[PDB]
Design a protein around this ligand. Structure first.
Ligand SMILES: *[C@@H]1O[C@H](CO)[C@@H](O)[C@H](O)[C@H]1NC(C)=O
Length: 219
């Protein structure tokens, strides 16, 4: 009897590279993945988390990874993983902490990420992700720590941080932010009002000025 969490998780092993044989213990033929290393299950024998951090893993993620609904913590951080973040990660409803940081990830940040309403922690940082933030992120009210730092990020949608009332720490620094007015108006004002929330200094592109220091004129 196939597990379907194990099948979903094995689809990841097929597309990744170790080379440390980290995933050697992932056997889909077992009744459940709960006995796998780097995998933890609840008393109901479903996968609530995956810690692959620092496994020296290369390759790309897979859309089948969204098949784990009870997945709470996904730690993929500190690897060589490339490609784009799958939209199917928006199908993890019970996802609390999503850590993709310190990887090669390219492309846009998925808009379906705004479908995680239990997500309290999002770290996409130290990646190649290209500039914008999904407007749907405002739908995460439980967001506390958001780290986007060290990426290709450029702009931000107006009023996106307004519905995040639980936001504590945020990392926007080391990004090619567009400080031209009146695009940078919201972010500059938000980073100044919320400056206790920001960790590090977000610098404007080519000027080197902090985003918060920018004051946009009307007319
Ligand atoms: C989302 O997950 C549920 C259960 O985990 C599954 O039944 C459904 O097909 C998934 N949908 C997509 C689009 O992945």
């Amino acid at each position: 009897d196939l597990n379907t969490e194990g099948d979903a998780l094995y689809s990841l092993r097929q597309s990744l590279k170790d080379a440390n044989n980290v995933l050697q213990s992932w056997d889909p033929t077992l009744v459940n993945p709960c006995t796998w290393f780097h995998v933890t299950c609840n008393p109901d024998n479903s996968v609530i988390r995956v810690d692959l951090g620092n496994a020296q893993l290369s390759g790309a993620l897979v859309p089948q990874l969204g098949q784990l609904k009870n997945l709470q913590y996904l730690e993929l951080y500190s690897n060589n993983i490339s490609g784009t973040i799958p939209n199917e990660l928006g199908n993890l409803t019970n996802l609390v902490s999503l850590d993709l940081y310190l990887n090669n990830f390219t492309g846009f940040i998925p808009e379906t990420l705004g479908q995680l309403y239990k997500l309290r922690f999002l770290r996409l940082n130290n990646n190649s992700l290209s500039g914008s933030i999904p407007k749907s992120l405002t739908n995460i009210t439980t967001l506390q720590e958001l780290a986007l730092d060290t990426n290709q990020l450029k702009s931000v949608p107006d009023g996106i941080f307004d519905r995040l009332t639980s936001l504590q720490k945020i990392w926007l620094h080391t990004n090619p932010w567009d400080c031209s007015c009146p695009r940078i108006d919201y972010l500059s004002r938000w980073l100044n009002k919320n400056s206790q929330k920001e960790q590090g200094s977000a610098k404007c592109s080519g000027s080197g000025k902090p985003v918060r220091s920018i004051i946009c004129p009307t007319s």
